[PDB]
Short mmCIF file of C-alpha atoms in Angstrom, two decimals:
data_model
loop_
_atom_site.label_atom_id
_atom_site.label_comp_id
_atom_site.label_asym_id
_atom_site.label_seq_id
_atom_site.Cartn_x
_atom_site.Cartn_y
_atom_site.Cartn_z
CA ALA A 293 49.61 -3.84 11.66
CA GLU A 294 50.49 -3.93 15.36
CA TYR A 295 53.96 -2.49 14.79
CA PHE A 296 52.45 0.60 13.16
CA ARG A 297 49.75 0.85 15.82
CA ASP A 298 52.32 0.74 18.62
CA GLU A 299 54.33 3.68 17.23
CA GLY A 300 51.26 5.92 16.93
CA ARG A 301 50.33 5.65 13.25
CA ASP A 302 46.61 5.36 12.57
CA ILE A 303 45.99 2.05 10.79
CA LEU A 304 43.13 1.01 8.53
CA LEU A 305 42.73 -2.77 8.75
CA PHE A 306 40.67 -4.66 6.16
CA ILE A 307 40.38 -8.42 6.88
CA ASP A 308 38.29 -10.38 4.31
CA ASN A 309 35.87 -13.23 5.23
CA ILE A 310 37.11 -13.80 8.83
CA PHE A 311 34.82 -16.80 8.24
CA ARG A 312 37.55 -18.53 6.22
CA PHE A 313 39.87 -18.08 9.20
CA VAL A 314 37.29 -19.94 11.29
CA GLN A 315 36.73 -22.52 8.55
CA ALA A 316 40.45 -23.26 8.22
CA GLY A 317 40.55 -23.60 11.99
CA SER A 318 37.69 -26.09 11.77
CA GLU A 319 39.42 -28.17 9.09
CA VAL A 320 42.70 -28.18 11.02
CA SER A 321 40.87 -29.15 14.21
CA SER A 322 39.12 -32.01 12.42
CA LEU A 323 42.49 -33.27 11.20
CA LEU A 324 43.93 -32.75 14.71
CA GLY A 325 41.57 -35.29 16.29
CA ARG A 326 39.63 -32.82 18.43
CA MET A 327 35.99 -33.58 19.17
CA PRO A 328 33.76 -31.47 16.83
CA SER A 329 31.56 -28.77 18.48
CA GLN A 330 28.04 -27.93 17.15
CA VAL A 331 28.08 -28.07 13.30
CA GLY A 332 31.43 -29.82 12.79
CA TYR A 333 33.22 -26.78 14.20
CA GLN A 334 36.30 -26.87 16.38
CA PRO A 335 35.76 -27.06 20.16
CA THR A 336 38.18 -24.13 20.50
CA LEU A 337 36.09 -21.80 18.34
CA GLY A 338 35.56 -19.00 20.84
CA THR A 339 39.17 -19.11 22.04
CA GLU A 340 40.66 -18.95 18.53
CA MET A 341 38.22 -16.19 17.61
CA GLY A 342 39.18 -14.19 20.68
CA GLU A 343 42.89 -14.72 20.11
CA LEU A 344 42.49 -13.25 16.63
CA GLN A 345 40.08 -10.44 17.50
CA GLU A 346 41.45 -9.07 20.78
CA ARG A 347 44.58 -8.08 18.87
CA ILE A 348 42.29 -5.97 16.64
CA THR A 349 41.97 -3.12 19.12
CA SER A 350 42.73 0.58 19.19
CA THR A 351 44.98 1.11 22.22
CA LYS A 352 46.26 4.28 23.86
CA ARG A 353 49.46 4.32 21.79
CA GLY A 354 47.62 4.16 18.46
CA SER A 355 44.33 3.29 16.80
CA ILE A 356 43.29 0.57 14.35
CA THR A 357 40.11 1.24 12.35
CA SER A 358 39.27 -2.36 11.52
CA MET A 359 36.71 -3.10 8.81
CA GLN A 360 36.10 -6.83 8.40
CA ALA A 361 33.96 -8.97 6.13
CA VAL A 362 32.22 -12.17 7.23
CA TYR A 363 30.70 -14.95 5.12
CA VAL A 364 27.63 -16.67 6.57
CA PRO A 365 27.23 -20.32 5.37
CA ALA A 366 24.54 -19.82 2.68
CA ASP A 367 22.22 -17.24 4.34
CA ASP A 368 22.52 -18.77 7.87
CA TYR A 369 23.13 -16.10 10.52
CA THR A 370 22.91 -18.55 13.46
CA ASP A 371 26.01 -20.42 12.28
CA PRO A 372 28.69 -20.57 15.02
CA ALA A 373 31.25 -18.50 13.10
CA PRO A 374 29.20 -15.30 12.54
CA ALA A 375 27.56 -15.96 15.91
CA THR A 376 30.97 -15.63 17.56
CA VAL A 377 31.87 -12.66 15.36
CA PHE A 378 28.83 -10.59 16.37
CA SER A 379 30.03 -10.00 19.94
CA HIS A 380 33.49 -8.88 18.73
CA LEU A 381 32.32 -5.71 16.95
CA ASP A 382 31.35 -2.09 17.50
CA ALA A 383 29.29 -1.73 14.30
CA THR A 384 27.45 -4.65 12.69
CA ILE A 385 26.24 -4.72 9.08
CA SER A 386 24.02 -7.48 7.70
CA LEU A 387 23.66 -8.11 3.96
CA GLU A 388 20.50 -9.95 2.95
CA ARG A 389 20.09 -12.19 -0.07
CA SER A 390 16.51 -10.97 -0.53
CA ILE A 391 17.50 -7.30 -0.70
CA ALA A 392 20.30 -8.03 -3.17
CA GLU A 393 17.93 -10.06 -5.36
CA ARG A 394 15.79 -6.91 -5.56
CA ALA A 395 18.83 -5.08 -7.03
CA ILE A 396 19.04 -2.85 -3.93
CA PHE A 397 22.68 -3.73 -4.13
CA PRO A 398 24.22 -2.08 -1.05
CA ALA A 399 21.85 -4.64 0.45
CA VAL A 400 22.36 -3.62 4.09
CA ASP A 401 19.42 -4.66 6.24
CA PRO A 402 18.67 -1.60 8.43
CA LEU A 403 16.88 -3.70 11.05
CA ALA A 404 19.69 -6.27 11.41
CA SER A 405 22.42 -3.59 11.31
CA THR A 406 23.37 -1.70 14.47
CA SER A 407 26.23 0.35 15.85
CA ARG A 408 27.53 1.34 19.26
CA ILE A 409 28.03 5.02 18.39
CA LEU A 410 24.42 5.44 17.22
CA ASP A 411 23.91 7.54 20.35
CA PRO A 412 22.81 11.20 20.29
CA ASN A 413 25.81 12.25 22.39
CA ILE A 414 28.29 10.93 19.80
CA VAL A 415 26.70 11.01 16.34
CA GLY A 416 24.32 13.93 16.96
CA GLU A 417 20.73 14.27 18.08
CA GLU A 418 19.22 14.78 14.62
CA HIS A 419 21.21 11.86 13.17
CA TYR A 420 20.05 9.61 16.00
CA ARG A 421 16.42 10.70 15.67
CA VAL A 422 16.42 10.15 11.90
CA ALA A 423 18.06 6.73 12.18
CA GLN A 424 15.68 5.56 14.91
CA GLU A 425 12.69 6.78 12.90
CA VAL A 426 14.03 5.04 9.78
CA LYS A 427 14.17 1.83 11.84
CA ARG A 428 10.71 2.27 13.40
CA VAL A 429 9.21 2.86 9.92
CA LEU A 430 11.22 -0.12 8.54
CA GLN A 431 9.83 -2.27 11.43
CA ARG A 432 6.22 -1.25 10.70
CA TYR A 433 6.73 -2.52 7.14
CA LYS A 434 8.21 -5.83 8.30
CA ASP A 435 5.20 -6.27 10.60
CA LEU A 436 2.74 -5.47 7.78
CA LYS A 437 4.70 -7.51 5.22
CA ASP A 438 2.38 -10.53 5.26
CA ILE A 439 -0.74 -8.34 5.42
CA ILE A 440 0.44 -6.64 2.23
CA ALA A 441 1.59 -9.95 0.77
CA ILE A 442 -1.73 -11.85 0.75
CA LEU A 443 -4.57 -9.38 1.33
CA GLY A 444 -3.17 -6.25 -0.28
CA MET A 445 -2.20 -2.66 0.42
CA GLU A 446 -5.76 -1.30 0.60
CA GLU A 447 -6.82 -3.02 3.84
CA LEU A 448 -4.29 -1.01 5.85
CA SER A 449 -5.28 2.20 7.58
CA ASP A 450 -4.36 5.52 5.98
CA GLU A 451 -1.38 6.08 8.28
CA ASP A 452 -0.24 2.46 7.96
CA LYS A 453 -0.52 2.82 4.17
CA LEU A 454 1.52 6.03 4.26
CA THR A 455 4.21 4.45 6.43
CA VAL A 456 4.36 1.43 4.11
CA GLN A 457 4.87 3.66 1.07
CA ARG A 458 7.50 5.68 2.93
CA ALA A 459 9.19 2.43 4.00
CA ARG A 460 9.38 1.25 0.40
CA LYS A 461 10.81 4.62 -0.61
CA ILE A 462 13.39 4.32 2.19
CA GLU A 463 14.33 0.81 1.04
CA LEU A 464 14.85 2.07 -2.50
CA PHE A 465 16.74 5.12 -1.21
CA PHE A 466 19.44 3.17 0.65
CA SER A 467 20.57 2.01 -2.80
CA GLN A 468 23.62 3.98 -3.89
CA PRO A 469 25.85 3.65 -6.97
CA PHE A 470 29.50 2.99 -6.20
CA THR A 471 32.59 4.07 -8.11
CA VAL A 472 33.84 0.47 -8.09
CA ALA A 473 30.42 -0.93 -9.07
CA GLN A 474 30.06 1.34 -12.11
CA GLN A 475 30.46 -1.72 -14.37
CA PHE A 476 27.23 -3.30 -13.12
CA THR A 477 25.02 -0.22 -12.80
CA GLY A 478 25.97 2.29 -15.48
CA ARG A 479 25.35 5.18 -13.10
CA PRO A 480 28.53 6.86 -11.80
CA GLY A 481 29.42 6.47 -8.15
CA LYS A 482 28.01 8.92 -5.60
CA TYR A 483 29.78 9.97 -2.40
CA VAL A 484 27.05 11.09 0.02
CA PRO A 485 28.39 12.76 3.20
CA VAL A 486 26.76 11.76 6.47
CA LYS A 487 25.26 15.23 6.94
CA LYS A 488 23.58 15.07 3.53
CA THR A 489 22.35 11.55 4.33
CA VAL A 490 20.77 12.76 7.57
CA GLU A 491 19.18 15.74 5.81
CA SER A 492 17.87 13.54 2.99
CA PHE A 493 16.27 10.99 5.28
CA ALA A 494 14.87 13.68 7.58
CA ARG A 495 13.24 15.29 4.55
CA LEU A 496 11.96 11.91 3.34
CA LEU A 497 10.36 11.19 6.72
CA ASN A 498 8.99 14.74 7.07
CA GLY A 499 6.65 14.13 4.13
CA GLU A 500 8.68 15.80 1.40
CA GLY A 501 8.98 13.48 -1.58
CA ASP A 502 5.71 11.69 -0.87
CA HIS A 503 4.35 12.73 -4.27
CA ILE A 504 7.44 11.32 -6.02
CA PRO A 505 7.04 7.74 -7.31
CA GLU A 506 9.25 5.23 -5.53
CA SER A 507 11.05 4.42 -8.80
CA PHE A 508 12.99 7.71 -8.55
CA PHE A 509 14.68 6.83 -5.23
CA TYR A 510 16.64 3.99 -6.87
CA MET A 511 20.43 4.43 -7.16
CA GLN A 512 20.59 8.11 -6.24
CA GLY A 513 22.73 10.27 -3.98
CA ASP A 514 21.16 12.71 -1.54
CA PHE A 515 17.53 13.86 -1.73
CA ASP A 516 18.51 16.72 -4.04
CA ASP A 517 19.41 14.22 -6.76
CA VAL A 518 16.01 12.56 -6.35
CA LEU A 519 14.28 15.94 -6.65
CA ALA A 520 16.33 16.79 -9.73
CA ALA A 521 15.47 13.46 -11.35
CA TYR A 522 11.77 13.96 -10.63
CA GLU A 523 11.86 17.51 -12.03
CA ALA A 524 13.66 16.30 -15.16
CA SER A 525 10.87 13.71 -15.47
CA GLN A 526 8.23 16.37 -14.69
CA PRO B 239 11.80 -21.19 11.62
CA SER B 240 12.13 -24.37 13.72
CA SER B 241 9.96 -26.80 11.69
CA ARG B 242 7.14 -26.19 14.22
CA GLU B 243 6.59 -22.44 13.92
CA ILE B 244 6.50 -22.90 10.14
CA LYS B 245 3.91 -25.66 10.58
CA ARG B 246 1.74 -23.24 12.57
CA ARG B 247 2.25 -20.61 9.87
CA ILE B 248 1.20 -23.10 7.19
CA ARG B 249 -1.94 -23.96 9.14
CA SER B 250 -2.69 -20.25 9.56
CA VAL B 251 -2.36 -19.42 5.87
CA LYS B 252 -4.40 -22.50 4.95
CA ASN B 253 -7.18 -21.14 7.17
CA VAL B 254 -6.77 -17.79 5.42
CA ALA B 255 -7.14 -19.48 2.04
CA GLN B 256 -10.27 -21.38 3.08
CA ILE B 257 -11.91 -18.25 4.51
CA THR B 258 -11.00 -16.23 1.43
CA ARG B 259 -12.39 -18.86 -0.95
CA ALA B 260 -15.63 -18.91 1.03
CA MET B 261 -15.77 -15.12 0.81
CA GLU B 262 -15.26 -15.34 -2.95
CA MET B 263 -18.11 -17.83 -3.32
CA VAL B 264 -20.56 -15.78 -1.26
CA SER B 265 -19.51 -12.62 -3.09
CA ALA B 266 -20.25 -14.41 -6.36
CA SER B 267 -23.76 -15.23 -5.18
CA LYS B 268 -24.11 -11.63 -3.95
CA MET B 269 -23.09 -10.32 -7.37
CA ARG B 270 -25.59 -12.65 -9.02
CA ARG B 271 -28.49 -11.36 -6.95
CA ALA B 272 -27.35 -7.73 -7.23
CA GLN B 273 -27.23 -8.03 -11.02
CA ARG B 274 -30.71 -9.55 -10.88
CA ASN B 275 -31.90 -6.57 -8.84
CA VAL B 276 -30.32 -4.11 -11.29
CA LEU B 277 -32.02 -5.81 -14.23
CA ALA B 278 -35.34 -5.87 -12.34
CA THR B 279 -34.99 -2.13 -11.67
CA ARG B 280 -34.08 -1.44 -15.32
CA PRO B 281 -37.70 -1.23 -16.65
CA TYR B 282 -38.69 1.61 -14.32
CA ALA B 283 -35.47 3.46 -15.15
CA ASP B 284 -35.71 3.25 -18.93
CA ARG B 285 -39.48 3.82 -19.10
CA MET B 286 -39.02 7.00 -17.07
CA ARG B 287 -36.01 7.85 -19.26
CA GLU B 288 -38.05 8.06 -22.45
CA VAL B 289 -40.95 9.64 -20.54
CA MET B 290 -38.61 12.43 -19.43
CA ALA B 291 -37.23 12.74 -22.96
CA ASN B 292 -40.76 13.17 -24.33
CA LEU B 293 -41.66 15.66 -21.60
CA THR B 294 -38.59 17.86 -22.08
CA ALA B 295 -39.12 17.72 -25.84
CA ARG B 296 -42.36 19.67 -25.34
CA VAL B 297 -40.98 21.93 -22.58
CA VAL B 298 -38.40 23.78 -24.67
CA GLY B 299 -39.00 27.41 -23.70
CA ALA B 300 -36.64 28.88 -21.13
CA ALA B 301 -39.51 30.47 -19.19
CA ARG B 302 -41.17 27.10 -18.53
CA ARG B 303 -37.79 25.34 -18.13
CA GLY B 304 -37.87 26.14 -14.42
CA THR B 305 -37.55 24.36 -11.06
CA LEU B 306 -35.41 21.22 -11.54
CA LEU B 307 -35.11 21.59 -15.33
CA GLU B 308 -33.53 25.06 -15.27
CA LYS B 309 -29.93 25.28 -16.50
CA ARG B 310 -28.67 27.74 -13.89
CA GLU B 311 -26.03 30.30 -14.81
CA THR B 312 -23.22 31.49 -12.52
CA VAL B 313 -22.87 28.22 -10.63
CA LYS B 314 -21.81 28.94 -7.04
CA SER B 315 -22.43 25.80 -4.94
CA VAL B 316 -22.12 22.19 -6.08
CA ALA B 317 -23.17 18.99 -4.30
CA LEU B 318 -21.65 15.59 -5.08
CA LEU B 319 -23.13 12.22 -4.15
CA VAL B 320 -20.76 9.37 -3.27
CA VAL B 321 -21.79 5.72 -2.90
CA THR B 322 -19.26 3.47 -1.18
CA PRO B 323 -19.20 -0.04 0.29
CA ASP B 324 -20.28 -0.34 3.90
CA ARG B 325 -17.47 -2.86 4.53
CA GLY B 326 -13.88 -3.28 3.40
CA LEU B 327 -12.11 -6.04 1.47
CA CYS B 328 -13.27 -4.44 -1.80
CA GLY B 329 -9.70 -3.89 -3.00
CA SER B 330 -8.99 -0.64 -4.83
CA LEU B 331 -12.69 0.14 -5.40
CA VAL B 332 -13.09 2.27 -2.26
CA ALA B 333 -9.74 3.96 -2.87
CA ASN B 334 -10.64 4.59 -6.51
CA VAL B 335 -14.03 6.16 -5.79
CA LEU B 336 -12.62 8.30 -2.97
CA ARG B 337 -9.71 9.45 -5.13
CA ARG B 338 -12.21 10.44 -7.82
CA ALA B 339 -14.32 12.31 -5.26
CA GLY B 340 -11.29 14.09 -3.83
CA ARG B 341 -9.97 15.22 -7.20
CA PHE B 342 -13.46 16.29 -8.30
CA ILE B 343 -13.67 18.37 -5.12
CA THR B 344 -10.29 19.80 -6.11
CA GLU B 345 -11.50 21.02 -9.51
CA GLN B 346 -14.83 22.25 -8.11
CA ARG B 347 -12.95 24.34 -5.54
CA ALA B 348 -10.50 25.46 -8.24
CA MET B 349 -13.28 27.26 -10.13
CA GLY B 350 -14.56 28.79 -6.87
CA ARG B 351 -17.60 26.56 -6.27
CA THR B 352 -18.12 25.61 -2.63
CA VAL B 353 -18.66 21.86 -2.31
CA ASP B 354 -20.89 19.84 0.05
CA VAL B 355 -20.73 16.07 0.53
CA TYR B 356 -23.61 13.59 0.54
CA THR B 357 -22.47 10.02 1.20
CA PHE B 358 -23.89 6.51 1.05
CA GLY B 359 -21.88 3.82 2.79
CA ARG B 360 -19.74 3.86 5.90
CA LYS B 361 -16.39 4.05 4.07
CA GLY B 362 -17.10 7.36 2.36
CA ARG B 363 -18.74 8.71 5.51
CA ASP B 364 -15.72 7.86 7.65
CA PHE B 365 -13.22 9.15 5.08
CA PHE B 366 -14.99 12.48 4.65
CA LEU B 367 -15.43 12.89 8.40
CA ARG B 368 -11.72 12.23 8.93
CA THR B 369 -10.60 14.57 6.14
CA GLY B 370 -12.80 17.38 7.49
CA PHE B 371 -16.07 17.56 5.56
CA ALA B 372 -19.12 17.08 7.75
CA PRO B 373 -21.62 14.73 6.03
CA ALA B 374 -24.51 16.96 5.01
CA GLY B 375 -26.52 13.80 4.40
CA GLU B 376 -25.54 10.44 5.89
CA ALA B 377 -27.02 7.04 5.02
CA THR B 378 -25.41 3.73 6.01
CA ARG B 379 -26.43 0.13 6.70
CA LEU B 380 -27.82 -0.19 3.18
CA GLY B 381 -28.25 -3.88 2.43
CA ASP B 382 -27.34 -5.62 -0.79
CA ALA B 383 -30.96 -5.06 -1.94
CA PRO B 384 -31.82 -1.55 -0.75
CA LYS B 385 -35.28 -0.10 -1.24
CA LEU B 386 -35.80 3.29 -2.85
CA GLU B 387 -37.43 4.47 0.39
CA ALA B 388 -34.02 4.09 2.06
CA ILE B 389 -32.43 6.69 -0.26
CA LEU B 390 -35.11 9.36 0.25
CA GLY B 391 -33.41 10.75 3.37
CA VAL B 392 -30.51 11.94 1.18
CA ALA B 393 -32.15 12.40 -2.22
CA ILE B 394 -35.02 14.58 -0.98
CA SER B 395 -32.52 16.65 1.00
CA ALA B 396 -30.34 17.19 -2.08
CA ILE B 397 -33.34 18.08 -4.25
CA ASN B 398 -34.64 20.53 -1.65
CA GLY B 399 -31.19 22.11 -1.44
CA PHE B 400 -31.14 22.53 -5.21
CA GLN B 401 -34.66 23.97 -5.18
CA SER B 402 -33.77 26.48 -2.44
CA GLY B 403 -30.70 27.73 -4.32
CA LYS B 404 -28.36 26.07 -1.82
CA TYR B 405 -26.73 23.96 -4.55
CA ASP B 406 -26.41 25.26 -8.11
CA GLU B 407 -25.54 21.80 -9.49
CA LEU B 408 -25.59 18.15 -8.44
CA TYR B 409 -23.32 15.18 -9.17
CA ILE B 410 -23.02 11.51 -8.24
CA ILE B 411 -19.90 9.35 -8.01
CA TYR B 412 -20.55 5.61 -8.31
CA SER B 413 -18.68 2.46 -9.28
CA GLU B 414 -19.70 1.49 -12.81
CA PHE B 415 -20.00 -2.24 -13.50
CA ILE B 416 -18.16 -2.47 -16.81
CA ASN B 417 -17.33 -6.17 -16.45
CA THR B 418 -17.30 -8.96 -13.89
CA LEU B 419 -13.61 -8.10 -13.34
CA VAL B 420 -13.19 -4.46 -14.43
CA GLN B 421 -14.89 -1.65 -12.50
CA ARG B 422 -14.07 2.06 -12.57
CA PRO B 423 -15.54 5.05 -10.73
CA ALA B 424 -17.86 7.19 -12.83
CA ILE B 425 -19.24 10.73 -12.72
CA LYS B 426 -22.81 11.67 -13.65
CA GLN B 427 -24.73 14.94 -13.86
CA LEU B 428 -27.89 15.13 -11.76
CA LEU B 429 -29.23 18.39 -13.14
CA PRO B 430 -31.32 16.87 -15.95
CA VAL B 431 -29.94 18.35 -19.22
CA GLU B 432 -31.96 15.61 -20.90
CA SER B 433 -31.02 13.96 -24.20
CA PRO B 434 -32.92 14.88 -27.43
CA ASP B 435 -33.36 11.07 -27.79
CA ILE B 436 -35.77 9.48 -30.35
CA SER B 437 -38.45 10.10 -27.66
CA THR B 438 -37.54 13.83 -27.66
CA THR B 439 -37.78 13.59 -31.49
CA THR B 440 -41.08 11.64 -31.08
CA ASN B 441 -43.87 14.26 -31.52
CA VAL B 442 -46.71 12.18 -29.94
CA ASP B 443 -48.88 14.98 -28.52
CA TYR B 444 -50.00 14.52 -24.93
CA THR B 445 -52.55 15.81 -22.41
CA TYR B 446 -51.44 16.81 -18.91
CA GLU B 447 -54.47 16.72 -16.62
CA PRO B 448 -53.00 18.23 -13.41
CA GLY B 449 -50.96 20.56 -15.65
CA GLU B 450 -47.74 20.52 -17.63
CA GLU B 451 -45.85 22.53 -15.00
CA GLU B 452 -47.23 20.40 -12.16
CA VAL B 453 -46.39 17.14 -13.94
CA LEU B 454 -42.90 18.49 -14.61
CA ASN B 455 -42.33 19.54 -10.99
CA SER B 456 -43.63 16.17 -9.77
CA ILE B 457 -41.70 13.97 -12.22
CA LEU B 458 -38.26 15.62 -12.17
CA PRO B 459 -37.64 14.74 -8.49
CA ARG B 460 -38.74 11.15 -9.11
CA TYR B 461 -36.51 10.92 -12.19
CA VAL B 462 -33.54 12.13 -10.14
CA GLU B 463 -34.38 9.64 -7.39
CA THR B 464 -34.55 6.87 -9.99
CA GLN B 465 -31.12 7.88 -11.30
CA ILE B 466 -29.69 7.79 -7.77
CA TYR B 467 -31.29 4.39 -7.13
CA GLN B 468 -29.78 3.05 -10.35
CA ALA B 469 -26.38 4.38 -9.30
CA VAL B 470 -26.68 2.83 -5.83
CA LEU B 471 -27.62 -0.59 -7.20
CA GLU B 472 -24.81 -0.36 -9.76
CA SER B 473 -22.43 0.44 -6.91
CA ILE B 474 -23.69 -2.52 -4.87
CA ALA B 475 -23.08 -4.85 -7.81
CA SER B 476 -19.62 -3.35 -8.34
CA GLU B 477 -18.88 -3.71 -4.61
CA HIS B 478 -19.66 -7.42 -4.68
CA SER B 479 -17.70 -7.94 -7.91
CA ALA B 480 -14.67 -6.07 -6.56
CA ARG B 481 -14.81 -8.10 -3.36
CA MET B 482 -14.96 -11.27 -5.48
CA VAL B 483 -11.84 -10.27 -7.40
CA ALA B 484 -10.01 -9.15 -4.26
CA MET B 485 -10.79 -12.44 -2.50
CA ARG B 486 -9.76 -14.48 -5.53
CA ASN B 487 -6.43 -12.64 -5.58
CA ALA B 488 -6.08 -13.12 -1.82
CA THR B 489 -6.78 -16.85 -2.11
CA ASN B 490 -4.19 -17.20 -4.87
CA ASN B 491 -1.65 -15.26 -2.81
CA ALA B 492 -2.42 -17.42 0.23
CA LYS B 493 -1.89 -20.57 -1.83
CA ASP B 494 1.43 -19.20 -3.10
CA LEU B 495 2.50 -18.38 0.45
CA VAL B 496 1.45 -21.86 1.57
CA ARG B 497 3.67 -23.30 -1.16
CA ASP B 498 6.62 -21.15 -0.08
CA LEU B 499 6.07 -21.92 3.61
CA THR B 500 5.84 -25.63 2.78
CA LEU B 501 9.20 -25.40 1.02
CA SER B 502 10.67 -23.64 4.06
CA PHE B 503 9.12 -26.22 6.40
CA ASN B 504 10.58 -29.09 4.37
CA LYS B 505 14.01 -27.45 4.44
CA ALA B 506 13.74 -27.01 8.22
CA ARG B 507 12.58 -30.62 8.66
CA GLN B 508 15.52 -31.98 6.68
CA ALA B 509 17.91 -29.72 8.59
CA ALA B 510 16.52 -30.91 11.93
CA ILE B 511 16.85 -34.57 10.96
CA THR B 512 20.41 -34.01 9.74
CA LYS B 513 21.33 -32.17 12.94
CA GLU B 514 19.92 -34.85 15.24
CA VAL B 515 21.53 -37.76 13.37
CA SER B 516 24.86 -35.91 13.26
CA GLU B 517 24.70 -35.30 17.02
CA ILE B 518 23.77 -38.93 17.70
CA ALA B 519 26.62 -40.17 15.50
CA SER B 520 29.07 -37.83 17.24
CA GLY B 521 27.90 -39.07 20.64
CA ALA B 522 28.23 -42.70 19.57
CA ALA B 523 31.82 -42.04 18.47
#
């Protein structure tokens, strides 16, 4: 990829499970007689990781739009390999086992996912406001999760109850059918532009769609598709 | 999740489970005594029920069907009575009764009838204050065994409003005690429209010493007050039953969460032991 970057061509770089790079390094280090660091990992974990990742950079001559995948041992996010990966990124995405088990298959955890360009100067003021509100609301639900779990939904205040229902609708709404995942969910794939995503979530937070049951936010595109599904259901 | 925070969480949810089980037990005793009170109030209610049936059997002419017995035409103002728990933890009971009251207000305003609220219990009072309606009549701090004298402050006001033309009809919303587990909100008409029951069919002829009209005007308000007292006691029993069910569900959920947290704690404990022995072995070598 570096040859094409150096001559000015824009490069899309997809590296899969950088974690197996780290794991192979760990196995080789174990065979090499090095003293293991932390959980059986190589002592030169950070250095190897940096040597790989500092070459993944958009320079002045050309740009590389890297898009990696990382495997966390089981569901452990404190493992040394992802722990070293997290500082080597501009945008982080976290996939949770619990969300996937709920069939919300894009499975991105909004609270554990961040980005550097989620700044109103870059991405836009309305986009930033909607994203930050969708994280605040998501947080409220995580804080009230146990309260809902044991006691129930009725002991919350009216506004807490409304934010919990909106949070559940938001969770269901991040689900999106994919063209490549059409085999699993029969629904065809949906390409939702970022502007339509911002409009849809702004409308969802504004109060529009409160009357709609949460079941209609599952595997849909923009808010217009949700409204159309509700109208078809009457 | 460090095998010590989870231990604290387990202790916390165990305390939750103990408190919730205690709440369930006391709510069971509360339901027992509230059912006893309802059954002890039943004789007055049913005796007055057939007395009213007999009285309205004789008073059949429209001219003498006046005061509280009149079936007013062109209804313009409607009052609804709501009885709610004074405290929370009742589960969906408070939400159910308030949803029923709100939708009933919706239909009553749909036909053009202005609506006024009369509330028993702090939950309904607070909800209707927050939503906008000023409580025309407010009564709270009603114990599990309220006396009929405690309801007069609202019932007499409603009856006087109906007498003065302020309200053209009267309703009550209360939690019916269908079962120990199943309770729904219910709607009842407070303008008499009495039933032609066997008593109404009964033709036992009577003598009314103070006068038929005076006996009518003195017994209709007491019959309405008896109906409201029955509804309030029914709602108290339903409150305690709903709290029992809610606390049983909460105790079961707390036990399930204790089980899950114990599994997580055991996993963390094993992980900690494995980590420390691995570190010690690495240091030895």
